[PDB]
Design a protein around this ligand. Structure first.
Ligand SMILES: [Zn+2]
Lengths: 100, 119, 50, 71, 86, 52
RNA sequence: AAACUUUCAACAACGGAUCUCUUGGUUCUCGCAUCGAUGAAGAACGCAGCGAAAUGCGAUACGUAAUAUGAAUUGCAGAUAUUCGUGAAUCAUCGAAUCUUUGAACGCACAUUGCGCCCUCUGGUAUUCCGGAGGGCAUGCCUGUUUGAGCGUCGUUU
RNA sequence: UGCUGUAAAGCUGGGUCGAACGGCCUCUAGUGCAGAUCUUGGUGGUAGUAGCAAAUAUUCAAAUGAGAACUUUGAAGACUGAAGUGGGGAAAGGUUCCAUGUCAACAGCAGUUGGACAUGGGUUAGUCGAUCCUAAGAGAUGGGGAAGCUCCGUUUCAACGUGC
RNA sequence: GCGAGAGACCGAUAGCGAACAAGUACAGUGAUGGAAAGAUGAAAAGAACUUUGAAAAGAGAGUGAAAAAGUACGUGAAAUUG
RNA sequence: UUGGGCCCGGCUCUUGUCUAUGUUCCUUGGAACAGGACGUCACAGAGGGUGAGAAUCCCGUGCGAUGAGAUGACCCGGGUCU
């Protein structure tokens, strides 16, 4: 059971794991279908862009202070400063975050 | 090929039953002859003619019922749609399109705009 | 037995009619694979289990 | 069965399995316009029903069977 | 005398024909079918008997109504009659 | 291969003392399959060694 | 020396390996969402000119109507069936129907093809009996209608 | 028929056969059998062997037939001996019933015979049974448990007549 | 479930139990258990006719490219046998 | 900043129909779909059938074209009436 100068392993395979094996054979098929869905969605609303405008926010932790990423929605104060109501903002391709 | 359906549909209730009785005695007479022939392919022709006349009688009869119940709130269930049990429980177009007056005021006030970028 | 129900007698009627040899003109059809009736039953060999 | 039309004044018919003697007695009155003294029914081993219909003395069974056309 | 002599005394059927499934599994004294569970509302079926589900399920009979559901769905559950082309 | 291929049997080993190998065998009677071995890679109708 | 035994070769047997096939299986991927009291899945019994099974169908029974198409079906036989045409064959398509006895199965019951009751029509000299045809009679629950019960309770008159 | 290789094997001559197949450089694997009381299928020796020996018992002739110990008929001789090897039924079986034809398989010999095979025919009810009653019992309803499949209860803490 | 497209997959003791009238035949009181079984030939052209025989069949003949393809059907190995 | 109902399209789905080029010559063979010669078409040399390995015999394939039918308050593009 234990015989060599080898590392001691943690292989969690004592359950019926073979009944829950998910092999992603459809990775290429999913890629193609995702592209087709994206194309149809874009064509449905042309020339209006598919992606709403997102804000820029600081990543929260001491580890990711330096990085800055895309947020979820512009705060109500930010939209207030540019004279766009949140209800009207959501209709012209701008995302709103009431929580931030 | 036996009787022609389009000729039957021009016949009245009285005439269709008179023809139905004769076709039945035609089949009755042939079943007597089958005991001696014994092969008699004419059996198959008369049976389909009996079926055709029975079909025309029923279809012409069901059309009178459909006309009688046209526009009534409650009509016989056999005259109703037979889509599926689930589709009959589904909300109708009018029911599913109902909105609260609060919801209508906001949808009118803030419609989905049409716009473009880079201009 | 002589005293039997209608369902019992009704099943025995079907068992008799299914116990006939193959009609001869069947083997003359094109691409015919049936050479005999393979579901024959004898009253003493195999019981109906009714 | 052809012996009974001559000896016993009885007609032999194949009859529906769902019918009874009341319906059989009536049916021969529309179909052949003959009166049945009695109707004796029988379910054959093959699953069909057989009716022994004895006509009253006012009718001759052999004559009717010629009219039907099987003797 | 538990073998051949005792086997000669078998003339009382414990089971008769069932009405729901016609299998000759209807226990006469219990008034229950050992196969389909009649006269319970639900069919007798167990997940420890997968071969038993194969023997009696959808597709093992006529499907006299389920044959044409796909055909009717493909046409969107049409109502009316076909129009003759002039 | 199918996961249940070769394993759609209720075969039990007869044990020893019946002058036959201890491979699991099909029970019942009245069919020629009764009393025949099952579940083995060496058996006819069993499952392959290390199914793919 | 034959016979016999053993071995081999040729031929002939027995048997069905090998080879080559394949309207089957298995796996992966893509797409779709559609059973049932408007009676499902299932079961039984039947139905063809000559059919036992399988396939199909339900007493309109290897099927009817309709749309399309356009000369077959086929083992045999056969039209009071068809050919420059409302016209052969077709589960080609399918939107109208039929859909036995059952089955969640629903008048009660069912190891029985048992026993009812109601309505309309009809036969037997019949509101009451008998026969037939058609249509009905399950349970829980919801909204309503009608009829009620309770000194539960309100106003009135002795 | 031979040749090559230590070998695993490869190539070839003759016969059979009728539709695909092979060398070389690489890749890949459900890749090599004498055994597992291995699996499935098939075939031997044993071996024309063991055996086909309970229920007293058969014989003569004719007929049919290609063919007769075994079929039919006659003549005998026998037995079951009325708690029968007789005549009916219940359970169970399901066409085994009857006629005609027939002998590939079955009847552990034979077969012209048969409960076999093939084709048809056959079961008639106001009075015989079921159907109805209740027995031991089973089991719905109102209710009460149980996550629930369902359990208890049988008039049960019920406003219980599909009354006459 | 329905509708499709594929594979360094199996090739009739394999692959689903089932390439076939397969969840069939068959067994069990029952719950359940559960097989075997593909291949003539391009086309039946599936052997007319004569003869021996009670018949089955045989011998001639015939069909076919082939009967060293006769449905006890492509090839026809071994055990075993003449 | 702005309501609703229809009429025709577009998009989505199903379905109908329509289309290039040898069966030329010789040999073997029962059969040419084999071999050889000469070709042709190719946005079509996928696959299948046809008496043996068939792009060119047939169905299809490729290219598209043109009809019918649906479906979508919760898609737009035009109209039209409020
Ligand atoms: Zn049952």
């Amino acid at each position: 059971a234990i015989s060599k100068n080898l590392p001691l392993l943690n292989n969690h395979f004592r359950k019926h794991w073979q009944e829950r094996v998910r092999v992603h054979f459809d990775q290429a098929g999913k890629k193609a279908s995702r592209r087709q869905s994206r194309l149809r969605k874009a064509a449905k609303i042309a020339p209006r862009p598919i992606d709403a405008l997102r804000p820029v926010v600081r990543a929260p932790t001491v580890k990711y202070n330096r990085k800055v990423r895309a947020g979820r929605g512009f705060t109500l104060a930010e939209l207030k400063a540019v004279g766009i109501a949140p209800k009207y903002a959501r209709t012209i391709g701008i995302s709103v975050d009431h929580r931030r | 090929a036996g009787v022609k359906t389009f000729e039957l549909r021009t016949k009245s209730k009285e005439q269709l039953e008179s023809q139905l009785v004769e076709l039945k005695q035609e089949l009755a007479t042939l079943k007597v002859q089958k005991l001696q022939r014994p092969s008699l392919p004419r059996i198959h022709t008369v049976r389909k003619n009996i079926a055709r006349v029975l079909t025309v009688i029923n279809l012409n009869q069901r059309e009178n019922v459909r006309a009688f119940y046209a526009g009534k709130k409650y009509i016989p269930k056999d005259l109703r749609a037979k889509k599926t049990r689930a589709l009959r429980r589904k909300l109708t177009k009018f029911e599913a399109s109902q909105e609260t007056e609060k919801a209508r005021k906001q949808r009118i006030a803030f419609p989905q705009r049409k716009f473009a970028i880079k201009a | 037995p002589s005293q039997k129900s209608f369902r019992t007698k009704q099943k025995l009627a079907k068992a008799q009619k299914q116990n006939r040899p193959l009609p001869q003109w069947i083997r003359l059809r094109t691409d015919n694979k049936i050479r005999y009736n393979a579901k024959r039953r004898h009253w003493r060999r195999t019981k109906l289990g009714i | 069965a052809m012996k009974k039309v001559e000896d016993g004044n009885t007609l032999v018919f194949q009859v529906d399995i769902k019918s009874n003697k009341h319906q059989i007695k009536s049916a021969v009155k529309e179909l052949y316009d003959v009166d049945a003294l009695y109707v004796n029914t029988l379910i054959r081993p093959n699953g069909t029903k057989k009716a022994y219909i004895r006509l009253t003395s006012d009718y001759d069974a052999l004559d009717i069977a010629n009219r039907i056309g099987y003797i | 005398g538990k073998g051949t002599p005792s086997l000669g005394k078998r003339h009382n059927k414990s089971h008769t024909l069932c009405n729901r499934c016609g299998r000759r599994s209807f226990h006469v004294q219990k008034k229950t079918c050992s196969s389909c569970g009649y006269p319970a509302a639900k069919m007798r079926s167990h997940n420890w008997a997968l071969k038993a589900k194969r023997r009696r399920t959808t597709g093992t009979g006529r499907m006299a109504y389920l044959k044409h559901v796909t055909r009717r769905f493909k046409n969107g559950f049409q109502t009316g009659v076909a129009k003759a082309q002039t | 291969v199918a996961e249940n291929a070769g394993h759609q049997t209720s075969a039990e080993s007869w044990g020893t003392g019946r002058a036959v190998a201890r491979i699991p065998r099909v029970g019942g009677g009245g069919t020629h399959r009764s009393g025949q071995a099952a579940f083995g890679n060496m058996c006819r109708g069993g499952r392959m060694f290390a199914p793919t």
